[PDB]
Amino acid sequence: NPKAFPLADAALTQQILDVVQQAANLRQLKKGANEATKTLNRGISEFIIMAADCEPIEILLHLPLLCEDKNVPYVFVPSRVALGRACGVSRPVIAASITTNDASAIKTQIYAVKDKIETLL
Amino acid sequence: PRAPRTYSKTYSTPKRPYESSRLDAELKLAGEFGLKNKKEIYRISFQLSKIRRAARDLLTRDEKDPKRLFEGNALIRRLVRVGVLSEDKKKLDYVLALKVEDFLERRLQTQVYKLGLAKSVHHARVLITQRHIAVGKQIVNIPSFMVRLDSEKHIDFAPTSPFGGARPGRVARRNAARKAE
Amino acid sequence: SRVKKRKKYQKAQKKLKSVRAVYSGGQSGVYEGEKTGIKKGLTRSVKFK
Amino acid sequence: GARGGAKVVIEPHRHAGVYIARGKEDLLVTKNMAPGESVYGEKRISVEEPPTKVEYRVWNPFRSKLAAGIMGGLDELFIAPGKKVLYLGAASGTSVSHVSDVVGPEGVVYAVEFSHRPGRELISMAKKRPNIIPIIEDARHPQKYRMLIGMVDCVFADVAQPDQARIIALNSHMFLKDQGGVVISIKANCIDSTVDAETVFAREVQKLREERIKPLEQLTLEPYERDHCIVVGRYMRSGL
Amino acid sequence: TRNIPQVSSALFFQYNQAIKPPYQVLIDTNFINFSIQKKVDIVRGMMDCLLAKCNPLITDCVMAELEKLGPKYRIALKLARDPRIKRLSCSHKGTYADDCLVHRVLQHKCYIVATNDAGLKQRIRKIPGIPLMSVGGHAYVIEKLPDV
Amino acid sequence: AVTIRTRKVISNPLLARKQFVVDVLHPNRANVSKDELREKLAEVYKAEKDAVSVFGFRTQFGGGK
Amino acid sequence: FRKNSDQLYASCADFKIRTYSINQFSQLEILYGHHDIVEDISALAMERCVTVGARDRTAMLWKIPDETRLTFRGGDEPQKLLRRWMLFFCEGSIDVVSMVDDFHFITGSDNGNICLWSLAKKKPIFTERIAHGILPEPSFNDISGETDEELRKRQLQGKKLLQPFWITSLYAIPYSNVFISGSWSGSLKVWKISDNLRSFELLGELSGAKGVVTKIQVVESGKHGKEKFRILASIAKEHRLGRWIANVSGARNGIYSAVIDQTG
Amino acid sequence: NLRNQNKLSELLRRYLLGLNHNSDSESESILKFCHQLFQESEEKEDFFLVNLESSNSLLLNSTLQKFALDLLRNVITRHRSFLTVSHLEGFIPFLRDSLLSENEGVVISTLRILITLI
Ligand SMILES: [Mg+2]
Ligand SMILES: [Zn+2]
């Protein structure tokens, strides 16, 4: 019913945020709504993470429409200030994208969370 | 005289080394993981064969047998500690599903390549053999070093390395001295 | 030996492209059509008997 | 490559309703049901004929997997002019519009989708195309939309679901004619990421066989996609 | 329209980079008979041979031929019908197993062919990237399986 | 700088001495001479240099210890 | 700084701890074992410094002489806290740490949890969930742009978007039973630890501070019987590490001071 | 097997005779004990998993139900005070359920108690 849907429970967010920080260290993370759109258009995204407290929430509802059309899992997180923390950038981030790389060192963790997101969806 | 001390071979020649299938598999594996020769692939195959023969012998035995429970649990523990076996697959059946490629993945060379410290597998081998890589506080100069899950996060440039914060190498300071002169 | 096998593998990768087509990152930039052209009367596909 | 000022020579494809634009490069093009606009920002070929100005749309293989099939050389395509088509997994006008282009005015396309948000675009695009029938429903329950569907010669399943075999069989049994058509896209990662792609592909072929689908053909979609194939079969109601 | 089959993406030249444990194995009628002669269990003698789980598979053709063998081969039919032995449907008129096994392997490069027939083996050995399994001496043997 | 640490200290009145394992941290240095370590151990233990003995020093692979 | 010593312990973003001798102006040793950035460090008269690794969610005590480390992990799950009750927020990162004792220390997490620790036990001995309260709920006129008010309320998703305050500061007086916690809630909270060192309670609050409490310090004066304690806390409009947090209404940049007199 | 069940039926009978001479049978706790006994009585993965091999719950519930009914009837017969409407009101819902049970043994014991309470 709410526009921000599905939005992860507490335990899932830490698993999500843990992957984001690892992806940031490994240069596999794209941060910000505009980059996420580009990755979806390129078909290079494993999945999309988004903030449900964005003010207004509306400015990031274009991404799920793109995500579904490419069959890309997506999920919201309650806090944007917390999402920026995981990304490693000095500022809040409302949307982030994990770039696809089957040769990455964190492939198992990315697919682990990715499976949970689909079950949520 | 002093008591004998034991030694063993870490590899075995394959049954038929001239099968084209084996040759092309070895080509792919060496190219992907930058292996110097086939003795490394034979070593990994020997280790995997020993592990999988043990796992098969365990799976023969009745479930709840003391020997099966104990030594199978030990094998799963060792495999997960090395990182080959995932945490969610802690069963001997998945041990029988293991492969050489995963042990090759756990090699230090592959990890220095993957983490981004090196731009290629061969560049990673050069860096490791060259004394530029440190796991934790220890310098490791061996590409075949098998890294653990905890040790994976500690791979970095050595403090003594020029890339890690030490002074420039001989070439750099030689060129600088010539430029100043 | 390590260098020799490196050149052997990368050479093998080139030949693999000739025997069969292989994914190469997908589309990059604007779609500019099939550079090598389309063959109307040829089918690459394997039939169920 | 195909820069806006270039001209192109259009000639027909082996499959009816499909065309090739020759030049320095070759493009797969379908004639536009609704001229003067693009469904998704695709390049369009305008041709003067006695004079009426007909328009054609380019078909991007990397964005439409059905197009990737024609690129790879499917021997036979059940989708053709004057044929009713049941498009399952119709996210938007990506391929349905191009499928609608092939069938033409006389034919019809039944687009089935689950999520509402793409349905808004599917409905809007469907209004430009009178021959397209969007069914915003869950394909796992064909009896929900048994109402809106007649017989269909070909069922094209674009659904990315682990249980894709079951949905195909249920839809085929209700609506697909005898000797009727089935064209399926399989992505192995979604169904079973644990095993290699080809073991997955063999599995669905068996799942098609138990459901009285005689598989006729299978083709992998590389270099346009990884881990994908298109399997073509025919529906023997009596038996295999 | 000319048709020339594509080379399977599973094969790096003649190396099959796809077949992987657990393995899927096709059973020929003679394979079951010889196995009974050598007192070798189907599921295990394969597990011992490859040191991996094996998923035995029987088509409609091989099952039909086993039935046609008669009461003398009642044992082979019972072993063939063990629940672990999964079954493959066939959509071709002929009941000849040799061509059906060859047609299946040509298309999906995931199967090991378990047979001792000289004629059938030769056809399989020509097809690239196809491991070939047989029973010889005391136990099973695998020829074109690099991981062993 | 250089650090000297002593561990596993055992009092041995049978030989009237103290036994221990000596770890020397010497970043940016080859290694420390036995006489120098004897001097510093004598200072730490408040005993004559003549009464301090040191031996069995192996530098770990990679240096620095 | 090591208490009554010139030894200095430096925590760096490279996942390492560095030790220095200021009288000597030289580096001594580098410590390894943290999987993430080492955000905070505390020390007492002994050489047993403690650190927190932020997202790794592990508190580390280092024995410099022994060259050994003890690993501490909170290991709490909102799932189990609910059934035993039959809003709990999982810890995301540990940002602050202060050593109450050579044998005890406290930590503060980003979920508003203040945890007491003992070296004997790897798990927390006592926890105080949502110590500083819950952040204000986002305004409905800003969550969404729709005209109808009810539509905007649905975007708030009830109370499920609410998140707790973070423990920006946490300081304990050495070898005492009292410690101070800080956040941008707008008040400094004073906690007293039990005599058995198994639990603590809220002694009181000081609402003068308004803004982000980056760091807290305490100084004492007077006779050994009668002392006056002065709490000095650095106050800022933004978090020390960066500019993530939204501007707090009324926040100002200054040094907060509170003199507490002792009577009984 | 049926033979073992017959052995168990003998064993349960011996326990019942012991309960008759047990002092607990004269306490009201046994009525609660009977009351308790009534209410307890009332593909991809398989692709990987090795396989090397070529419902007694209803019986369990009936056996407990038989024991409870046989215990209840004996206690009320031996101890008159327990044979009262107030004491045995709660067991009526179990008696009606027992009357519909498939096993002929339990319904017989259900008939035996009902005749006692007539
Ligand atoms: Mg050096
Ligand atoms: Zn057949």
CA–CA separation, D207 vs D182, rounded Å? 13
**Ion ligand 2 residue ranges (Cβ < 5 Å):** E 59, 61, 90, 100
Residue corresponding to tokens 């063998």: E69
CA–CA separation, D201 vs D190, rounded Å? 12
Cβ–Cβ below 8 Å for E90 and D240: yes
Nearest to D202 by CA among E10, A98, G219, C35: E10
Question: Considering only CB atoms, which chain D residues are within 8 Å of C37?
Answer: 25-26
**Beta strand segments in chain F, E:** 3-12, 17-25
Residues 6+ apart with CB under 8 A from D138: D114, D144
CA distances from B107 to A70, C7, D137, H52 (A): 36, 22, 50, 35
Cβ–Cβ below 8 Å for B93 and H48: yes
Of F60, F61, F63, which has the smallest distance from its Cβ to B160's Cβ?
F63
CA–CA separation, E69 vs E77, rounded Å? 9
Let me know: does G193 contact G173? Beta carbons within 8 Å.
Answer: no
Q: What is the largest CA-CA distance in chain E?
A: 52
C22 phi and psi, to 5 degrees?
Answer: -135, 145
Q: Hey, which chains touch G, using 3+ CB pairs under 8 Å?
A: A, B, F
Q: Centre a 10 Å sphere on the Cβ of residue C21 and count the other Cβ atoms it contains.
A: 18
Bridge partner residues of E3 (DSSP): C43
Q: Hey, which chains touch B, using 3+ CB pairs under 8 Å?
A: A, C, E, F, G, H
Let me know: does A73 contact A117? Beta carbons within 8 Å.
Answer: yes
CA–CA separation, F32 vs F39, rounded Å? 11
Strands G200-206 and G188-193, bridge-based pairing:
antiparallel
CA of B118 to the centre of ligand 1 (A): 19
Q: Counting ligands in written order, which one lies closest to the CA of residue E101?
A: 2
Cβ–Cβ below 8 Å for E6 and C44: yes
CA dihedral (A108, A114, A117, A119) positive or negative: negative
- DSSP H or E run through G231: strand G227-236
Q: Counting ligands in written order, which one lies closest to the CA of residue E91?
A: 2
Q: Centre a 10 Å sphere on the Cβ of residue A60 and count the other Cβ atoms it contains.
A: 22
CA–CA separation, B18 vs B14, rounded Å? 9
State the Rg of chain F over Cα: 12
CA distances from G112 to B5, D33, G87, G107, G128 (A): 60, 61, 12, 10, 8
Q: Centre a 10 Å sphere on the Cβ of residue B151 and count the other Cβ atoms it contains.
A: 17
**CA G24 to the chain's CA centroid:** 32
Give me the domain span that covers residue A83. 1-121
Strands D152-157 and D85-88, bridge-based pairing:
parallel
Let me know: does E101 contact E59? Beta carbons within 8 Å.
Answer: yes
Cβ–Cβ below 8 Å for G143 and A90: no
Let me know: does G231 contact G180? Beta carbons within 8 Å.
Answer: yes
Tokens coding E60: 């409609």
How far away is chain G from the Cα of A70, in angstroms, using its nearest Cα?
26
Cβ–Cβ below 8 Å for C9 and B36: no
Question: Considering only CB atoms, which chain E residues are within 8 Å of H54?
Answer: 82
According to DSSP, residue G138 is labeled P
G256 phi and psi, to 5 degrees?
Answer: -80, 135
Q: Centre a 10 Å sphere on the Cβ of residue G39 and count the other Cβ atoms it contains.
A: 20
State the Rg of chain C over Cα: 16
Of E6, E90, E110, which has the smallest distance from its Cβ to D220's Cβ?
E6
Q: Hey, which chains touch D, using 3+ CB pairs under 8 Å?
A: A, C, E, H
CA of E97 to the centre of ligand 2 (A): 6
Let me know: does G14 contact G29? Beta carbons within 8 Å.
Answer: no
Of B59, B60, B97, which has the smallest distance from its Cβ to H48's Cβ?
B97
**Beta strand segments in E32-142, E:** 54-59, 86-88, 111-114, 132-136, 139-142
How far away is chain D from the Cα of A14, in angstroms, using its nearest Cα?
24
Nearest to E9 by CA among G155, G2, D58, D200: D200
List chain B domain ranges.
Answer: 17-181
Q: Centre a 10 Å sphere on the Cβ of residue H43 and count the other Cβ atoms it contains.
A: 7
CA–CA separation, G241 vs G244, rounded Å? 9
Q: Decide if A17 touches G, using CB distance below 8 A.
A: yes
Q: Decide if H51 touches E, using CB distance below 8 A.
A: yes
SS3 G125: strand
Let me know: does G46 contact G4? Beta carbons within 8 Å.
Answer: no
Bridge partner residues of G10 (DSSP): G18
How far away is chain F from the Cα of G1, in angstroms, using its nearest Cα?
18
Residues 6+ apart with CB under 8 A from D174: D142, D143, D146, D149
- DSSP H or E run through G7: strand G7-12
CA–CA separation, A84 vs A24, rounded Å? 11
Residues 196-225 of D with CB under 8 A from C: 214-219, 222-225
Let me know: does E109 contact E10? Beta carbons within 8 Å.
Answer: yes
Residues 6+ apart with CB under 8 A from A84: A90, A91, A92, A93, G244
Four-CA torsion D89, D93, D97, D98, nearest 10 degrees = -80
Let me know: does G30 contact B159? Beta carbons within 8 Å.
Answer: yes
CA of E92 to the centre of ligand 2 (A): 6
**Strand ranges across the sheet with G7-12:** G7-12, G16-21, G26-31
Cβ–Cβ below 8 Å for B24 and E15: yes
Tokens coding B77: 């523990």
Cβ–Cβ below 8 Å for B137 and G32: yes
Strands D228-235 and B155-157, bridge-based pairing:
unpaired
B128 phi and psi, to 5 degrees?
Answer: -65, -55
Let me know: does D159 contact D133? Beta carbons within 8 Å.
Answer: no
SS3 E15: strand
**CA H1 to the chain's CA centroid:** 19
CA–CA separation, D192 vs E109, rounded Å? 17
Cβ–Cβ below 8 Å for B56 and E48: yes
Q: Decide if G14 touches F, using CB distance below 8 A.
A: no
Nearest to D162 by CA among D182, D189, D133: D189
Residues 36-65 of H with CB under 8 A from B: 48-50, 52
SS3 G236: strand
DSSP string, B102-171: HHHHTBHHHHHHHTTS-SSHHHHHHHHHTT-EEETTEE---TTPBPPHHHHTTEEE-TTSGGGTS---HH
According to DSSP, residue A57 is labeled G
H27 phi and psi, to 5 degrees?
Answer: -85, 160
CA–CA separation, B59 vs E100, rounded Å? 34
Question: Considering only CB atoms, which chain D residues are within 8 Å of C20?
Answer: 222
Nearest to A32 by CA among A106, A108, A101, A84: A84
Q: Decide if C9 touches B, using CB distance below 8 A.
A: yes
CA–CA separation, D146 vs D153, rounded Å? 16
Four-CA torsion B111, B116, B117, B120, nearest 10 degrees = 80
Q: Counting ligands in written order, which one lies closest to the CA of residue E98?
A: 2
Cβ–Cβ below 8 Å for A111 and D94: no
Let me know: does A94 contact A83? Beta carbons within 8 Å.
Answer: yes
Tokens coding E27: 């059973």
Cβ–Cβ below 8 Å for B137 and G30: yes
Full 3-state SS string of chain D: CCCCCCCCEEEECCCCCCEEEECCCEEEEEECCCCCCCCCCCCEEEEEECCEEEEEEECCCCCCHHHHHHHHCCCCCCCCCCCCEEEECCCCCCCHHHHHHHHCCCCCEEEEECCHHHHHHHHHHHHHCCCEEEEECCCCCHHHHCCCCCCEEEEEECCCCCCHHHHHHHHHHHHEEEEEEEEEEEEHHHHCCCCCHHHHHHHHHHHHHHCCEEEEEEEECCCCCCCEEEEEEEECCCCC
DSSP string, A2-47: -SS-SB--HHHHHHHHHHHHHHHHTT-EEESHHHHHHHHHHT-EEE
**CA G207 to the chain's CA centroid:** 18
CA–CA separation, D20 vs D144, rounded Å? 40
CA–CA separation, H79 vs H59, rounded Å? 30
Q: Decide if B119 touches C, using CB distance below 8 A.
A: no
The CATH number assigned to the domain holding A89 equals: 3.30.1330.30
Gaps in chain C following residue numbers (C to N > 2.5 A): none
CA–CA separation, D149 vs D126, rounded Å? 16
The letter for the amino acid at E121 is: K
Contact of chains G and A by CB distance (3 or more pairs under 8 angstroms): yes
CA–CA separation, B27 vs E12, rounded Å? 10
Summarize chain B as % helix, strand, coil (round to 5). Answer: 55, 5, 40
Q: Decide if B139 touches F, using CB distance below 8 A.
A: yes
CA distances from E103 to E20, E76, E120, G103 (A): 21, 24, 12, 74
Nearest to G209 by CA among G242, G151, G258: G258
Residues 6+ apart with CB under 8 A from G16: G30, G31, G32, G34, G38
Full 3-state SS string of C1-49: CHHHHHHHHHHHHHHHHHHCCCCCCCCCCCCCCECCCCCCCEECCEECC
**Strand ranges across the sheet with G227-236:** G212-222, G227-236, G254-261
Let me know: does G98 contact G52? Beta carbons within 8 Å.
Answer: no
Q: Where are the alpha helices (DSSP H) in chain F?
A: 34-45
CA–CA separation, D198 vs D153, rounded Å? 28
Let me know: does G35 contact G56? Beta carbons within 8 Å.
Answer: yes
Q: Counting ligands in written order, which one lies closest to the CA of residue B170?
A: 1
Question: Considering only CB atoms, which chain B residues are within 8 Å of C2?
Answer: 34-37, 122, 125
- Selected for mutation to probe chain A from D39, D63, D96, D117 (highest A CB count within 10 Å) is D117
Cβ–Cβ below 8 Å for F1 and G24: yes
SS3 B6: coil
Measured at the alpha carbon of residue D172, what is the angle toward residues D169 and D173, in degrees to the nearest 5?
Answer: 85
D212 phi and psi, to 5 degrees?
Answer: 65, 25
CA of B132 to the centre of ligand 1 (A): 9
Technique that determined the structure: cryo-EM
Question: Considering only CB atoms, which chain H residues are within 8 Å of B60?
Answer: 52
Question: Considering only CB atoms, which chain E residues are within 8 Å of D223?
Answer: none
The letter for the amino acid at C37 is: G
How far away is chain E from the Cα of C23, in angstroms, using its nearest Cα?
10
How far away is chain C from the Cα of B33, in angstroms, using its nearest Cα?
10
Residue corresponding to tokens 């049941």: D86
Burial class (CB within 10 angstroms; exposed 0-12, middle 13-18, buried 19+) of E52: buried
**Mutual orientation of helices D116-128 and D96-103 as an angle, nearest 10°?**
30
Cβ–Cβ below 8 Å for D198 and E109: yes
Size of interface A-B (CB pairs under 8 A): 10
Cβ–Cβ below 8 Å for D75 and E109: no
In chain F, the residue whose alpha carbon lies closest to the alpha carbon of G25 is F1
SS3 G259: strand
Four-CA torsion D76, D80, D84, D89, nearest 10 degrees = 60
Buried residues in G182-204 as b, exposed as e (16+ CB within 10 A):
bbbbbbbbbbebeeebeebeeee
Cβ–Cβ below 8 Å for F5 and G28: no
Q: Where are the alpha helices (DSSP H) in B7-37?
A: 20-33
Let me know: does H92 contact H38? Beta carbons within 8 Å.
Answer: no
Question: Considering only CB atoms, which chain D residues are within 8 Å of H48?
Answer: 194
CA–CA separation, A36 vs A121, rounded Å? 19
Bridge partner residues of A19 (DSSP): none
**Cis amide linkage into residue D81, ω under 30° from 0:** no
Let me know: does D68 contact D77? Beta carbons within 8 Å.
Answer: no
Domain count, chain A: 1
Tokens coding D63: 């964005």
Four-CA torsion G222, G224, G227, G232, nearest 10 degrees = 80
CA–CA separation, D119 vs G166, rounded Å? 42
